[PDB]
Amino acid sequence: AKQKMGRVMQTAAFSLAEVSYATGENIGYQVQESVSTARFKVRARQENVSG
Amino acid sequence: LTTAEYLAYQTERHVLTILTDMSSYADALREVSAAREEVPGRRGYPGYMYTDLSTIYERAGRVEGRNGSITQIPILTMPNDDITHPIPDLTGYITEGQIFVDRQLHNKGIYPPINVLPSLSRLMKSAIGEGMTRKDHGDVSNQLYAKYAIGKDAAAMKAVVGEEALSIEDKLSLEFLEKFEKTFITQGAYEDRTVFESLDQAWSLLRIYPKEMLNRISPKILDEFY
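ok -> structure tokens follow
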């Protein structure tokens, strides 16, 4: 999972660089401004793995 | 034992005496010994209890000249369920093998409350042969004992590591333990099971396993009976 996450992070960085180049400016400020609520949330699940 | 000696040796028949309450006999020996002004032995019992029990037990056995036999099943009553007790200790020394009746089995179910883990017969290999009974008896009995031990281990392990985490060889072993303590050992007080019928039922229980799981049984027996 660490190897896969590194590969996915590289791919996401490349995609973000391409998007920024296409837009002509950094969308970081706009994203920070539009950070009123988080669309992605994580809920813990008490899985029973072995004992 | 005198009647058994008569019948078996001067009549050429098999006897199988069943002496009951060897603990009661030992208490009687205690009272007879202490009436002669003799100091008690370890647990109050006379010191020569080993000699007396040896006479009573070794009064059994086969002889070359005669076609009869004297088998013996001296049924003891262990005080406080202690094997270190003198009567069980001396009886285990003199006799060969032992059959245990279990309080846990009695509480859990019905006759007979006999557990196979601590119970064994020392001359079993002679009785379970090829010409006598069936040629699969030894393999089936060894397999049943091993899988009963594994079933007890799995029953203890389920409450520790969860039911799901148990392996296939542990879940099947737990199922075998259930069907073993509930159908094979469990016998009506009046129903008669021949040795061949008992071995057939043992195979019926052992068939819940894959043919590869049964390791103690010889490959020829597995191919012929399974």
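Residues 14 and 38 of chain A are 24 Å apart (CA to CA).
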